[PDB]
Design a protein around this ligand. Sequence first.
Ligand SMILES: CC[C@H]1OC(=O)/C=C/[C@H](C)[C@@H](O[C@@H]2O[C@H](C)C[C@H](N(C)C)[C@H]2O)[C@@H](C)C[C@@H](C)C(=O)/C=C/C=C/[C@@H]1CO[C@@H]1O[C@H](C)[C@@H](O)[C@@H](O)[C@H]1OC
Ligand code: HEM
Length: 393
Amino acid sequence: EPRAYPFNDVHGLTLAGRYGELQETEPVSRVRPPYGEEAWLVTRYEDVRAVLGDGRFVRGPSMTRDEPRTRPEMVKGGLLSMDPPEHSRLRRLVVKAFTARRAESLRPRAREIAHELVDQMAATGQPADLVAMFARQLPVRVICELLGVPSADHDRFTRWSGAFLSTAEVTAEEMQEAAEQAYAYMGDLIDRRRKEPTDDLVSALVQARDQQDSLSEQELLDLAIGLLVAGYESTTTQIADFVYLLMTRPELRRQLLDRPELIPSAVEELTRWVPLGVGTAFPRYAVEDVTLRGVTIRAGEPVLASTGAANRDQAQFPDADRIDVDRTPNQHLGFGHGVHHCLGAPLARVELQVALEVLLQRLPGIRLGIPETQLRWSEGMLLRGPLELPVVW
Ligand SMILES: CC[C@H]1OC(=O)/C=C/[C@H](C)[C@@H](O[C@@H]2O[C@H](C)C[C@H](N(C)C)[C@H]2O)[C@@H](C)C[C@@H](C)C(=O)/C=C/C=C/[C@@H]1CO[C@@H]1O[C@H](C)[C@@H](O)[C@@H](O)[C@H]1OC
Ligand code: HEM
């Protein structure tokens, strides 16, 4: 009786047709994911937004429940497994240090790093793999700059970080070594910034105060490693997907070459359009019985809120399947919604904008070097995107 879930095919970015069918005829339905409990699935924009925004839907049961999910292993802990008021305290302290101003201040360095990456990619000759050489490098290097990791240490910190990618081919113990190296390095960097503060985010986290209160040593460390992992693969995947779309849809590339000022609005539109998750936002758990479009979701039950389907709801976005780089309004849920809305989003925006700006400026003819039908897609099962993107220009 519940439908097998996910509906999305991982071998591309297509939004499964089942979502549109369900938005019309069964907007709140039952699904059986590959691992974890059967769950409610919500697909309309209004209902996804309601689930992500409602006080009655919590994340804390993620710590113990067999969470409906797409892989055998779990992704749990950190802010995304917390609820108000504990979540609220940690969040206030972080955003006091990790501001929209600080994200914007990283644009000039993000551009320098992007141009160095294009230098290095171009120098390996054509075709070159945009994923390994650019998409997998820019976000982790930008997080190193954000945090305050010295330049000299970016290559090794990058190597450690790559072990946390859901596409990494590494053993339980190799992941273990990598995490221990990253955590020991970050613990020492925190200790150095406490003694001698600088202008970077670790120093600003150490100095953050809210209602007389501050981040403990353990919270500082968990937050720094958490921001790295939350901000690396996501951004890397989204860069690869946006450039894949630019290379395969000529009008999109043309419009951004002719009007580079449309880049920030294009980043919003691509974030709305690309159904980046294989499945949904992380499951929310009813704290009491909730009626949604006539269906009773009982206290304790999990709900999968598809921001992928939501952002393609024809009731919210006129001609929702068209990519219109100048779409206004554009209140998409691609960075989430409610108290857990992406805290890295101002920085993700700078990076995605910088990625398109620099690739288009330096390589206006960038295009696939193999037929599109021959691209190899990630089977990490969390996010969708190409494993390799051989490009020519
Ligand atoms: C908040 C910090 C936390 O941040 C996340 O929980 C991020 C989750 C992202 C939102 C996720 O994306 C969403 O997925 C959906 C399937 C689709 C969504 N969408 C397109 C709508 C997409 O937005 C995930 C899957 C992104 C990928 C790259 C990932 O696995 C990140 C893990 C980060 C964990 C870190 C926590 O770190 C762990 O902290 C605990 C405390 C440590 O002891 C240690 O263990 C450390 O260990 C890495
Ligand atoms: C394009 C890249 C990114 C996308 C698409 C993205 C998307 C998301 C979404 C949809 C959520 C909400 C998840 C949910 O409610 O289930 C989220 C949360 C979060 N994101 Fe991002 N993100 C990206 C980049 C980043 C970056 C660059 C950082 C840090 C530098 C970051 C840090 C976080 C953190 C810490 C959370 C949890 C916030 C909380 O629970 O209060 N993200 N992200």
